[PDB]
Amino acid sequence: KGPAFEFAVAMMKRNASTVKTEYGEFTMLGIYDRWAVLPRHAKPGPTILMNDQEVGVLDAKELVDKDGTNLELTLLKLNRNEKFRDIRGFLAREEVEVNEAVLAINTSKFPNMYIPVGQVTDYGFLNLGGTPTKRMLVYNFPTRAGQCGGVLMSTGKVLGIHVGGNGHQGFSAALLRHYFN
Ligand SMILES: *[C@@H](CC(=O)OCC)[C@H](C[C@@H]1CCNC1=O)NC(=O)[C@H](CC#C)n1cccc(NC(=O)c2cc(C)on2)c1=O
Ligand SMILES: O=P([O-])([O-])O
Ligand SMILES: O=P([O-])([O-])O
Numbered sequence: 001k002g003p004a005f006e007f008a009v010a011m012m013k014r015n016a017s018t019v020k021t022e023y024g025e026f027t028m029l030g031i032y033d034r035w036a037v038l039p040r041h042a043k044p045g046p047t048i049l050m051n052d053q054e055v056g057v058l059d060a061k062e063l064v065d066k067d068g069t070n071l072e073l074t075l076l077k078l079n080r081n082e083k084f085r086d087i088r089g090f091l092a093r094e095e096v097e098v099n100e101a102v103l104a105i106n107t108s109k110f111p112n113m114y115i116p117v118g119q120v121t122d123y124g125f126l127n128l129g130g131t132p133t134k135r136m137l138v139y140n141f142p143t144r145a146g147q148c149g150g151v152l153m154s155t156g157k158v159l160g161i162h163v164g165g166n167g168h169q170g171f172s173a174a175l176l177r178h179y180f181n
């Protein structure tokens with residue numbers, strides 16, 4: 001479990017922020033240039049609060065697959081000068097399964113917390129919040145509101161973004177490299 005945690009802490013420090021939209025408070029991972037990712041249910045408007053600062057949103061893309069099925073991710077392009085360190089090389093081209101993963105959260109409710117969530121399985125199809133959804137990764141741990149946008153990692157890999165769950169079951173949207181240019 002140790003190297004996953006070492007990787008996770010360094011990744012959050014360099015690429016993560018805390019974001020508020022009108023729909024809640026989230027962990028947000030910057031990906032490259034001015035592109036970042038949120039859960040689709042964050043519903044970012046024309047501005048967001050990023051580390052307590054108003055930042056304009058230049059574009060937002062709610063991702064669906066080639067038949068229009070929800071992936072529960074929104075990509076957003078921010079109006080800011082600082083560029084994210086490019087982490088596209090840490091994103092797989094297809095869903096990753098691992099024996100040990102770490103879920104990293106940074107919000108006002110969960111300030112820099114890391115959770116060893118155990119094994120991650122490619123669950124696939126889920127009806128999530130009433131919406132047919134694909135590319136779900138599942139893991140078993142005691143889930144909580146406020147963990148969405150949390151970053152699911154293993155050693156040297158960013159696997160996905162936490163988007164949902166119930167009870168002791170959590171789900172991430174797989175974060176695939178082709179979603180980005
Ligand atoms: C993160 C967003 C946030 O905090 O929202 C506040 C209301 C949460 C994290 C969830 C809460 C319970 N445990 C978690 O891991 N995400 C949601 O609440 C999402 C948002 C969406 C879409 N959501 C909404 C509605 C239902 C569910 N869960 C399921 O439908 C479900 C199905 C199976 C199987 O397991 N869960 C959900 O996650
Ligand atoms: O968040 P920011 O303000 O852009 O830094
Ligand atoms: O289905 P997609 O388009 O590949 O995501």
Ligand SMILES: [N+]
Pocket residue numbers: 021022023042043044045
């Ligand atoms: N919003």
Ligand SMILES: [N+]
Pocket residue numbers: 111112
């Ligand atoms: N910390």
